[PDB]
Amino acid sequence: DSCIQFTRHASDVLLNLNRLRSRDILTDVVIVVSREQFRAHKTVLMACSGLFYSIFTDQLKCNLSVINLDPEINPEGFCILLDFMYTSRLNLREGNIMAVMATAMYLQMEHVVDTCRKFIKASE
Amino acid sequence: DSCIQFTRHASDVLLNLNRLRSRDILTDVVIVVSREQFRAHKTVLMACSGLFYSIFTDQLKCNLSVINLDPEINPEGFCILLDFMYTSRLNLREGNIMAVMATAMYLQMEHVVDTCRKFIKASE
């Protein structure tokens, strides 16, 4: 087509979605991790994760307001990934990289799994 | 902080939100324009428009599944702006610029109003 494009649009949209999350506005699901609860928007979770995409496109699960993750999932790893989903920023540290990579593999967040694999390979 | 950032994350999120819109997945509102209906996600509309932000933060309106726009709003102008919200791409043409700018002013989409004002000023 002959469209023009606003370079900062996608980033401004994500920034606003994160402001809604902060203020708990229109959040429609609670993700339960080892008795740690995280409120979020189903659409953002689906846009970021192959696991949430599969969950919320399921005719029965699409209507659930609570999703319980596998007990092996670490709440801090999940929190770091949820922050990444809403900001593009990943708080990757020596102390959390194993939990973050394991959580990203479970959530099916391929780009996160990729940078974790590379950061781990650099330290060996 | 000491975060790393994935450059294409915001764009990939918006692309996925637009794929959900295309497939009518988890759309939670219908916007009615001169008897033309548009399905969308409330959170994306709020992230893009000062008008939708004000509407869906209202304690009564936040629960509506149908929103009727002012009858002076042109459906094509709205359609072009809805596409922009989900893609960052604005289909601005000599034949639609007046309707697009009027719709962007009503929706409170300041960056769109700005480029319309500039494109109009260039043609005078």
Binding site: I4, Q5, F6, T7 | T115
Partner: peptide, 4 residues
């Protein structure tokens, strides 16, 4: 704004 840019030409994409």
């Amino acid at each position: 704004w840019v030409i994409p």
